[PDB]
C-alpha cells in the first residue's frame, strides 16, 4: 500500500491511498501488459458482512484524510499499514492539533497502537522507559514492535505557505514543491 498527498496553488487538495494489497501483490503480471495483479481478495474474511461475495469490495483500513482549520484546508495526510492506518493518521491529527507539532515533528514522532485484539499496547522505539513502566502500572501490556506507517503529508498556512513531511520510515521518498 502507498499514500501520497497533493496541494496546488489555488488551495485544491488531494489525498490518495492505493495498493496491490501485499508488496507486489500476487507477483503475477497479466500476460503481455506489464501489469502486476493485486491480491485484494485476501482482505475478505475467508471463513458475515466482510465475507467473500460477487461484485463486492473487501473492507480496507485505507484512510486518506483532509483536516480543515478556520474554514480552509490545513492538513492533508494518510499512510499504508493495514489496521494501523487508523492510529497512524490519528496520531498525525492529534500531534498537529493538540500538541502543536509542525508537520515534520508530527511525522518523525514515535507511534503507538492499540487495536483491542490482540490486547497489547504496541509501540515503536522511542518512548521513555519511565513512561512505559507507568503504562504497565496502569494495566497496559506494552509490546515493542517494528515501525508503523509511511505518512506523506502537507500542512497549509492560511496565507498559502506549504509545509511538508515524508516519513523517515520509508527510504527514497520525497516531499517537494515550488
Amino acid at each position: 500500500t502507498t499514500h501520497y498527498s497533493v496541494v496546488d496553488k489555488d488551495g485544491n487538495a488531494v489525498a490518495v491511498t492505493y495498493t496491490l494489497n501485499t508488496t507486489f501483490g500476487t507477483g503475477i503480471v497479466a500476460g503481455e501488459s506489464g501489469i502486476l495483479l493485486n491480491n485484494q481478495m485476501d482482505d475478505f474474511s475467508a471463513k458475515d458482512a466482510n465475507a467473500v461475495g460477487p461484485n463486492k469490495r473487501p473492507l480496507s483500513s485505507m484512510s486518506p484524510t483532509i483536516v480543515v482549520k478556520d474554514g480552509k484546508t490545513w492538513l492533508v495526510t494518510g499512510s499504508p499499514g493495514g489496521s494501523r492506518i487508523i492510529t497512524t493518521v490519528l496520531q498525525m491529527v492529534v500531534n498537529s492539533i493538540d500538541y502543536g507539532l509542525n508537520v515534520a515533528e508530527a511525522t518523525n514522532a514515535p507511534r503507538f497502537h492499540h487495536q483491542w485484539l490482540p490486547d497489547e499496547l504496541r509501540v515503536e522505539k522511542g518512548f521513555s522507559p519511565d513512561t512505559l513502566k507507568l503504562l504497565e502500572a496502569k494495566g497496559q501490556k506494552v509490546a515493542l514492535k517494528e515501525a508503523m506507517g509511511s505518512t506523506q503529508s502537507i500542512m497549509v498556512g492560511p496565507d498559502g505557505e506549504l509545509y511538508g513531511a515524508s516519513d523517515p520510515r520509508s527510504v527514497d521518498d520525497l516531499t517537494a514543491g515550488y
Partner: protein, 359 residues
C-alpha cells in the same frame, strides 16, 4: 485546542517549504513528476493522477494499474468528496472459494494464485477524478509514466531491497514477471535500469484510447486471458462492469477543526472520527506528547473503536453501516466516561457498543 506550529528554525525536524504547490509521496521520481505537472499549470487532481500513474511504474510494490484504492478531494471552494476505486470481487466469486478440503482457509490461494485478484479499479478511479475534477487530458498526465516505462529508470535502495526481500517470494515464480524484474537469474539491484516495455505499451494505449483500454480493450483481453488460462475468475464482463463510486466523506468536528476521511468501504475513516470524538472529552494538550496519561487515554479510546470496527462495518453497497451512531458525540461521551486514566480495561471486557440510543 492550543496554538498550532508551522515550524521555526529552532525545531529538530523541519518541514519542506513551498509557496505555490507541493507533493508528498513514497518515491522521489513520482513526487517530481507531480511537481512538474503543477509547474506546467495542472491542478491538484491533474498532478495526483500523474503521480499515481508514475508510481505504477516506479513503485511496482504498491503503485499500480492492477490494484485499487481511495481518494479524497477538497476543492478551493470547500467541496469535499471521496472516490472509491477499491477492487470488486469477480461475478464468479463465492463465499467458500478460499477453503481447502478440510474447510480451512488456504492463505496461498488468496495471496499468490489467480483467484487472489479483484477487478482492478485504479484506472477507473483516476479517470473518474480526472474527468470531473481535473483540467488536463489523460494523455498529458500519463506521459511522464509512459516515458519512465519505455526509457527505464535507475533502481534505488528502496526498490532493490523490496525486490530482494518481498519480490523474491512471488516474482521469479512466473516467467513473464521474472522477465521484467529479474536480470540474469537475480533481482534487479541498486544502479540497474528497470525498463518496462510491456507496461509502456499499456500506458501508451490508455493515453490514446482512454480508460476503456483497460476495461474493454487490449489490456482487458490480456487480463481475461491471463485469468482464463490460469484458473482465475476475472472476465471481460467483470472488467466492463467495473465502476468507481464517488461517495460522501465521513466528517467530524474536533476542537473546531473539521476532519474528513474515507467512508465505507474504508474501515478507517469512521473510526478516526470516532476516536477523535472520544478524545475531545479530555484535555490532551495538558498531558502532552508521549506521556503515560495521554497514551493511556488514547489506547483505551482506540480499544472501544476497534471493537465497534469488528462488528458494524461492511461494503455500503451491500450493508447498512451505522455511521451516524458510530460518529455520534453522545455515544463518544458514553465511551469517554468509561475510561479510567489509572486502569486499563482488559479487551475481554470490551464489546461492540449498544448503538440503539444513538440511531
Amino acid at each position: 485546542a492550543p496554538p498550532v506550529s508551522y515550524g521555526v528554525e529552532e525545531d529538530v525536524f523541519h518541514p519542506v517549504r513551498a509557496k505555490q504547490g507541493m507533493v508528498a509521496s513514497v518515491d522521489a521520481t513520482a513526487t517530481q513528476v507531480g511537481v512538474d505537472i503543477l509547474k506546467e499549470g495542472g491542478n491538484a487532481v491533474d498532478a495526483a493522477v500523474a503521480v499515481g500513474y508514475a508510481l505504477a511504474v516506479t513503485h511496482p510494490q504498491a503503485g499500480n494499474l492492477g490494484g485499487g484504492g481511495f481518494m479524497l478531494i477538497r476543492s478551493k471552494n470547500g467541496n469535499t468528496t471521496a472516490i472509491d476505486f477499491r477492487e470488486m470481487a469477480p461475478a464468479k466469486a463465492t463465499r467458500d472459494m478460499f477453503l481447502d478440503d478440510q474447510g480451512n482457509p488456504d492463505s496461498k490461494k488468496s495471496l499468490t494464485s489467480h483467484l487472489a485478484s479483484g477487478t482492478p479499479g485504479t484506472v477507473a478511479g483516476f479517470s473518474l477524478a480526472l474527468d470531473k475534477y481535473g483540467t488536463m487530458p489523460l494523455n498529458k498526465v500519463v506521459q511522464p509514466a509512459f516515458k519512465l516505462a519505455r526509457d527505464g529508470f535507475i533502481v534505488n535502495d528502496a526498490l532493490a531491497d523490496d525486490l530482494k526481500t518481498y519480490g523474491s517470494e512471488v516474482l521469479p515464480n512466473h516467467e513473464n514477471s521474472k522477465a521484467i524484474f529479474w536480470k540474469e537469474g537475480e533481482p534487479l539491484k541498486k544502479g540497474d535500469t528497470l525498463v518496462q516495455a510491456n507496461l509502456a505499451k499499456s500506458l501508451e494505449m490508455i493515453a490514446e484510447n482512454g480508460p476503456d483500454e483497460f476495461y474493454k480493450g487490449t489490456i482487458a483481453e490480456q487480463i481475461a486471458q491471463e485469468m482464463q488460462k490460469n484458473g482465475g475468475l476475472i472476465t471481460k464482463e467483470d472488467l466492463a462492469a467495473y465502476k468507481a463510486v464517488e461517495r460522501t466523506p465521513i466528517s467530524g468536528d474536533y476542537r473546531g477543526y473539521q476532519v474528513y476521511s474515507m467512508p465505507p468501504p474504508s474501515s478507517g475513516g469512521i473510526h478516526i472520527v470516532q476516536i477523535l470524538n472520544i478524545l475531545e472529552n479530555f484535555d490532551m494538550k495538558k498531558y502532552g506528547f508521549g506521556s503515560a496519561d495521554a497514551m493511556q487515554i488514547m489506547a483505551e479510546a482506540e480499544k472501544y473503536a476497534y471493537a465497534d470496527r469488528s462488528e458494524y462495518l461492511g461494503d455500503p453497497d451491500f450493508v447498512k453501516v451505522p455511521w451516524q451512531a458510530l460518529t455520534n458525540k453522545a455515544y463518544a461521551k458514553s465511551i469517554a466516561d468509561q475510561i479510567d486514566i489509572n486502569k486499563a480495561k482488559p479487551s475481554s471486557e470490551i464489546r461492540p457498543g449498544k448503538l440503539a440510543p444513538y440511531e
